[PDB]
Structure 1
Amino acid sequence: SNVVFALANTSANYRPLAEWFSQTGGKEKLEKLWNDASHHTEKKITKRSIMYWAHKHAPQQYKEIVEQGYFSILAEYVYSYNGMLEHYMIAKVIYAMMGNKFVVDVDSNGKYVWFEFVLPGQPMNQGEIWKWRKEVNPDELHIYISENFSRVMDRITEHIKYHLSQPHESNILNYYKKLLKAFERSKSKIFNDSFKKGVIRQAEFLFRQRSFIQTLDTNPHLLGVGNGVLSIETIPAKLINHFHEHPIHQYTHICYVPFNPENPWTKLLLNALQDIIPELDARLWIMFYLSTAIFRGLKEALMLLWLGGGCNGKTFLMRLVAMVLGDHYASKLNISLLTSCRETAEKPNSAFMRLKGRGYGYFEETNKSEVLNTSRLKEMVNPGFQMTATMVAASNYNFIIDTTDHGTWRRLRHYRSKVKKKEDPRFIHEYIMDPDCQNAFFSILVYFWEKLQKEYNGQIKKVFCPTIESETEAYRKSQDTLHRFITERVVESPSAETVYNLSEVVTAYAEWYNTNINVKRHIALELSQELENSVLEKYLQWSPNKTRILKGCRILHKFETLQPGESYIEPKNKWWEWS
């Protein structure tokens, strides 16, 4: 299939299909006929796939035919026009030379930016090994025009000198002499700076892709790692270590994933990130949400709070996942973006476009102890420029993010570290800086991402995690107010034929708050709309009198207990195995 979508750009692709796939064996393509003329698809791989599928399986014949085509193009261009060579035909041979190494596109300001594919035999930065890098000027292309094109120029000159020393009449001898003289005059032009600049600005129209800038890192299943390209489309990791048509640019210098090992470093990391916290039935949802940070966007919209513990593994795990990734997924994100008012009433500062293309946000610094949480959190956590997720808030032991919120945010999760000899801070001093531990944790992260992809494709449908949800409702209990009243006076009572009106529930909530917390003025409409969207939404139905009726429940009075018929509203083996 790959070859036929590669040459589907040919208008008459059926003839090469029957030429190449009716081949030992073949047997008339085993009588499929493109599976009876299969339907085309979107922008798949191109002719560069068949271009790459030589050069390591049969490199000698491939090199011979590419050299022969190179010489054929140059011979046609020096035979149609007598001896002089100029910018566009040098650009054409250059495009035939590295059409699979360089592209060029217009991005923002009307200027053409060049992207160069890199090879192992090339000076890279740290980890651009099989990825497109942005060049302000194609220095390698200028070098290749100056040096490597001279070999083909000498091939043309040798062909001309061979044709000169042949026995035909003197008119063809004189024609070849003047052709050789003019070509010799035009040969040194490829070393000229202005000529090479003209050739580059002419080849800018030939190397054009026009679907490169807008489709650069839109694919979420691709990672730029130090070994190359990591693809998480399949259940196992792919680790593309060869030429590819995936047009990604940004990379990470430390990922370097050699699958999941069992050496000393990954075992130390497994014993370090867990087994310090006493977990119930191998409770692992926390780092499970610390996975999926390799996914770019279009995911679930949860948020984790880890403001618990003083000298725990608080900043260690956050900063170590931050160091595991790079400009792919990292953002320091000072909490004043979402704390201490809405800065200067400005949403288009940082915020979304700081997290643009990111898949991990984190908030670690502390303002004093407590300021604010709400700001514009409700706007950013909702899907709507593009949507991304996996924000982990862990600032300090102090409860900083504590204001009023009653929008039944089920997408917010709270957790604290139950475990905070000496403190042993060397795990945050120099243990993170080791590249081997970062490599091992990236291996653990991709292993647990594919563990998500195998069993529970989505954390909503996974196995029940009691601790976080308990601490979460405990943080919801931190908000309490109406949440408390619902979990308190309000009780699911089906066998009860009583129907609770809006004003009755509002007055009960006001009385409970007056006898429970404090005294203040009440608004019946405001309390009604506040309790309208709460967890009793399922128990509120439409009355035939165009009103709302609270059915199948009871409201407890002062010193009222539960009535019958009413309801309220460890592996022996290792932990990371199947559970």
Structure 2
Amino acid sequence: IAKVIYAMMGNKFVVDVDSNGKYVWFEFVLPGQPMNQGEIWKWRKEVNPDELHIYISENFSRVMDRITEHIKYHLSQPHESNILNYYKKLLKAFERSKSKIFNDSFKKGVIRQAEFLFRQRSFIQTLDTNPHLLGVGNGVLSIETIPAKLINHFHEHPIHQYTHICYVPFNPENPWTKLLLNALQDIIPELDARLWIMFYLSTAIFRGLKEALMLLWLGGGCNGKTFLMRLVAMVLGDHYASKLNISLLTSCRETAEKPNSAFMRLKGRGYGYFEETNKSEVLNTSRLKEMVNPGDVTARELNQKQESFQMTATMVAASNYNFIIDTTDHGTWRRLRHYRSKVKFCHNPDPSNPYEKKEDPRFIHEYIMDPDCQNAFFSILVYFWEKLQKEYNGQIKKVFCPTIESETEAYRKSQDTLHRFITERVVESPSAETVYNLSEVVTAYAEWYNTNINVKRHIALELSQELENSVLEKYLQWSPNKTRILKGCRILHKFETLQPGICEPKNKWWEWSPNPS
């Protein structure tokens, strides 16, 4: 029975073992069957093949009746004494065994036997491996070639994850697309910055390896960044996007070895966003470098064993408070991007404030749920990703955007405590020399921000050569006792004194402008 069932529906089911050593049934959904919303043209996980359990008792009866008709017809034809015994006994045995196909225990045994016939090696680990295929509410979406192709028929691609948002080709003439484009234009005024941020957000669709980059851009108290954060999260869906807390980013005494389930996120996710926090927070490579680079990372499943999973999710962190970074590493400050919003929406916007507007409360939340709307936004992301692939060959670094990498480098010129000390205390005051192994200088530096800015555990080994990474060593030799005593400066306390010693888009901005843009 199991062999006949496999020969009769072997093209609709696959069986494979999971990491827990139990068989799992998969069913290929078809139009015209009861199903959830948007799970068409793709496999679905089945705890028990119930519809197989009813098929084996409904459709197999036709074959059994055909067999009975065949044996009856052969009994009709006259023969020798074989019809007396052989055919009669065969018919009696067959009618005895006909009712077995209805039995519950018999059906369970047949299913357990067909488990082995329907087994397909290397199916669980190859599910959703292709990053160029994306599940969609009306089939699957392929972005292997331009233009993107929508599949709404049979295929052999092992796709299981999906989102419940239908896909339509990008049409600017739809009212919702026009509204969304106008809102995006109003939220971010700069043309090049808008194009850059849209291009960066477009990569959330992709789930493969990505360039190691972090989007950390400051915004106004009322910029509206969260609105988009929620819009993209809702469009992608739970299976591809999730919300993350900022606590992980500022690593505490705990690390990856400590049990945690939040770190198990990003496993297959294509998007992750950091929302507004309470105040400016301190962080410096506190699991930041390992969250930036696309290298393979371990997977500590709480208190369970340590697995290994690849990180391929885009990350965005926007807040109204600054972020304390205390480092001078070029590598660390090379995989980050910074932008400052210039719009602060007001409910009574006077004309004398061009860089702000009125607020439409029903917006940050309104429409978000509107199905229709959703569908649209997608189209926008698909079109923008296709444009990025056409122009810059998938390299977000290769893009040209004058307003970016200038504010970022200005921010890099800030958040550096050493230069404040240099051109606040020692620069322009070289007419003295009182240095004790730079140890007194280190203490003055440490207490300086301890009172001026913030406090923390202090070490002096890293600060011994940190002075050499500045302009303070312009006169720094060593005594006969070595000790590398600085050879001129003036420690300053209290007042003291200075002792001697672009283009605006014409009508449409989504056309990206020509190659210079």
Q: Please classify the TM superposition score into its range, dividing by the shorter chain length.
A: 0.7 to 0.9
Deviation at 1:307, TM superposition (A): 3.3
* SS of structure 2 residue aligned to 1:105: strand
Task: Give the direction of change, closer, same or farther, for the CA distance of 1:461–1:289 in structure 2 (3 Å limit).
Answer: closer
Task: Give the direction of change, closer, same or farther, for the CA distance of 1:175–1:348 in structure 2 (3 Å limit).
Answer: same
Task: Give the direction of change, closer, same or farther, for the CA distance of 1:357–1:176 in structure 2 (3 Å limit).
Answer: same
Q: Distance in 1 between matches of 2:42 and 2:429?
A: 62
* SS of structure 2 residue aligned to 1:557: coil
Q: Distance in 2 between matches of 1:175 and 1:464?
A: 87
State the Cα deviation string for residues 4-27 of structure 1 (Å, max 9, x = none). Answer: xxxxxxxxxxxxxxxxxxxxxxxx
The answer (yes or no) to whether the contact 2:281–2:324 under 8 Å persists in 1 is yes
The answer (yes or no) to whether the contact 1:217–1:247 under 8 Å persists in 2 is yes
State the Cα deviation string for residues 323-353 of structure 1 (Å, max 9, x = none). Answer: 0012332121111122362557745523542
The answer (yes or no) to whether the contact 1:235–1:450 under 8 Å persists in 2 is yes
TM-score, normalization by structure 1: 0.69
Say which is worse superposed, 221-230 or 519-528, in terms of deviation: 519-528
Deviation at 1:394, TM superposition (A): 2.1
Deviation at 1:490, TM superposition (A): 16
State the Cα deviation string for residues 88-118 of structure 1 (Å, max 9, x = none). Answer: xx11111112212111110112110111110
State the Cα deviation string for residues 148-181 of structure 1 (Å, max 9, x = none). Answer: 1112222222222222222433414642222222
The answer (yes or no) to whether the contact 2:272–2:314 under 8 Å persists in 1 is yes
The answer (yes or no) to whether the contact 2:191–2:509 under 8 Å persists in 1 is no
TM-score, normalization by structure 2: 0.76
| More RCO (CA 8 Å, sep 6+) | 2
Deviation at 1:267, TM superposition (A): 1.5
| Equivalent residue, structure 1, for 2:347 | none
Task: Give the direction of change, closer, same or farther, for the CA distance of 1:425–1:147 in structure 2 (3 Å limit).
Answer: same
The answer (yes or no) to whether the contact 1:365–1:396 under 8 Å persists in 2 is yes
1:509 to 439, 442, 445: 445
Deviation at 1:253, TM superposition (A): 1.1
Deviation at 1:262, TM superposition (A): 3.0
Percent same amino acid among aligned pairs? Answer: 100
| Equivalent residue, structure 2, for 1:442 | 378
Task: Give the direction of change, closer, same or farther, for the CA distance of 1:94–1:483 in structure 2 (3 Å limit).
Answer: farther
The answer (yes or no) to whether the contact 2:146–2:386 under 8 Å persists in 1 is yes
The answer (yes or no) to whether the contact 1:337–1:343 under 8 Å persists in 2 is no
* SS of structure 2 residue aligned to 1:297: coil
Q: Distance in 2 between matches of 1:539 and 1:309?
A: 44
Deviation at 1:417, TM superposition (A): 2.0
Deviation at 1:560, TM superposition (A): 22
Q: Distance in 2 between matches of 1:289 and 1:130?
A: 30
Q: Distance in 2 between matches of 1:257 and 1:450?
A: 14
The answer (yes or no) to whether the contact 2:6–2:118 under 8 Å persists in 1 is yes
Deviation at 1:527, TM superposition (A): 5.3
Deviation at 1:308, TM superposition (A): 0.9
State the Cα deviation string for residues 375-429 of structure 1 (Å, max 9, x = none). Answer: 2112221233313231001244565778887654211111232112742121122
Deviation at 1:298, TM superposition (A): 1.1
1:329 to 240, 262, 269: 240
State the Cα deviation string for residues 423-477 of structure 1 (Å, max 9, x = none). Answer: 2121122211111111111111111111122111233453311222122123212
The answer (yes or no) to whether the contact 1:250–1:327 under 8 Å persists in 2 is no
The answer (yes or no) to whether the contact 1:309–1:397 under 8 Å persists in 2 is no
Say which is worse superposed, 490-499 or 376-385, in terms of deviation: 490-499
Q: Distance in 2 between matches of 1:299 and 1:536?
A: 40
* SS of structure 2 residue aligned to 1:380: helix
Mark the runs of 5 or more structure 1 residues left unpaired by the alignment.
1-89
Task: Give the direction of change, closer, same or farther, for the CA distance of 1:514–1:424 in structure 2 (3 Å limit).
Answer: closer
Mark the runs of 5 or more structure 2 residues left unpaired by the alignment.
296-308, 345-356
The answer (yes or no) to whether the contact 2:251–2:287 under 8 Å persists in 1 is no
The answer (yes or no) to whether the contact 2:430–2:489 under 8 Å persists in 1 is yes
Q: Superposition pairs for residues 219-230 of structure 1, below 5 Å?
A: 219-230=130-141
State the Cα deviation string for residues 300-331 of structure 1 (Å, max 9, x = none). Answer: 11110133112222111111000001233212
1:576 to 507, 510, 517: 510
Q: Distance in 1 between matches of 2:142 and 2:50?
A: 30
The answer (yes or no) to whether the contact 1:306–1:314 under 8 Å persists in 2 is no
Say which is worse superposed, 462-471 or 256-265, in terms of deviation: 256-265
Deviation at 1:368, TM superposition (A): 4.4
